[PDB]
Amino acid sequence: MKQIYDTLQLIPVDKIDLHEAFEPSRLEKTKESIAKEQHLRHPVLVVKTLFGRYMVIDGVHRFMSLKALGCEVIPVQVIQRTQYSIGSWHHKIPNGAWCEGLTDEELLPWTTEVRDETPFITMCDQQTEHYLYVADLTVDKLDIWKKVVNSYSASCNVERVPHSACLCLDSNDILMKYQPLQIGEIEAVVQRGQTVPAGVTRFNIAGRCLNLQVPLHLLKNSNLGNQEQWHTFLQKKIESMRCYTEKIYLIEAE
Amino acid sequence: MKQIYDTLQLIPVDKIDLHEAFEPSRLEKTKESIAKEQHLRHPVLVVKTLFGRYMVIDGVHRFMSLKALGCEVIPVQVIQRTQYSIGSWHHKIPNGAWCEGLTDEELLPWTTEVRDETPFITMCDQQTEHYLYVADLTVDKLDIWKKVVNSYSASCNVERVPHSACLCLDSNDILMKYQPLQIGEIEAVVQRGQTVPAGVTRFNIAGRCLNLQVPLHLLKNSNLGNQEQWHTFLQKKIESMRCYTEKIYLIEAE
Description:
Two copies of one chain form a homodimer.
Chain A: H1 2-5, E1 8-12, E2 16-17, H2 24-37, E3 39-40, E4 44-48, E5 54-58, H3 60-68, E6 73-78, E7 84-93, H4 100-103, E8 121-124, E9 129-132, H5 141-152, E10 159-162, E11 174-178, H6 183-191, E12 201-205, E13 208-210, E14 214-215, H7 224-238, E15 241-244, E16 248-251
Parallel strand pairs in A: 2-5, 4-6
Antiparallel strand pairs in A: 1-6, 3-14, 4-5, 7-10, 7-11, 7-12, 8-9, 8-11
Helix pairs in contact in A: 2-3
């Protein structure tokens, strides 16, 4: 389906922006893997913004790995707005008692009280839930998020779970719930040069292209000869492209 | 879901049955490819039947290729009835008026009469339909499906379209419409040692496991001591497994 071929592009690395922070540990493992394989398995998923720029909506650690590896162009799949919806990740913290970062950040005005306002953050254990609202918050919405997420993210052990999935907690777990953003909030965040915390925005994307395996060597120089090479490479790959429209379980290795 | 692990099994080759004819042209390219790669990319998709036997619902040519190569066990994924629905393929013949194999067959009792019985086969064009009913035909549904399908399968160009899909016939198209069978019927067929013609049944399966890349070395000797290797193999592959719930475009190459 050539409609997909036309959305696979090599974009100058300096024209791509993040809307979120990244976790440098995951960045370094992903980067090791790319350097070892000398391939980028999946294109980074981007949307057009303004000034001829692009915003990553999925693959921030791949993109950062390529930038850190000295790539001048990034293989992207350009996603239309009709192809995605915006949800969020909840952060499940196993053995959440031994997680010293959040373990006594008492000062924020957590409360079990529920009001018809929107609870910005919700903290869960097997028994109880706690909330945060800007009626009580002194600083702005997003640095609360940075503070809270960052208190446990890099120090404690986290597993991200989709905000829409069904999950029940053990008594070891703590579950951090963050409400999804609208695209206009994300756009404003990027336009102001800001970022949301790592690993909280979750884009549900239809029509992902998988297992492109872009050779790293193609990404090192920005020369339009390199672009002819990219078109050749891509034409070779599309012949092996098959569309799947039902749930699949993909082994991402070989 | 870790249930996948229990559904991926090595099954003796003599316990597996096909329900549909295979196209040997396609069988030879599948066989070729498997021999070159020394691996089976996707597991054969089967459902359990009677006498501890299994019926292939997708992967006829992978299976036949494996049997031709001397494999004693087939890597399969056991699909449960909640995972799949059964539809059919319609066969669109562009410029069907010039399909000689379909026109010279003046014998068959094609008819525009709409009866209360369901027709074996419906042959449509832009503004008129023809049917074949049991009452006008001396021999069984399957013999007629194979006779009609083979009158144009190799003779003329044919686009296979899902029966539920949207299709508007151009001025010169002809459309062969076949009934979707129920699983009881397909099972009866296999129980009598018969097969449906190729390219007519269409299984819509959710949760296909993809890109397992089973090494061929594991399929030649069917001994309990092989199973350990298998299980080892499997547990390794699962650690690279990922579920995709939206439509994907997978590059099935490396």
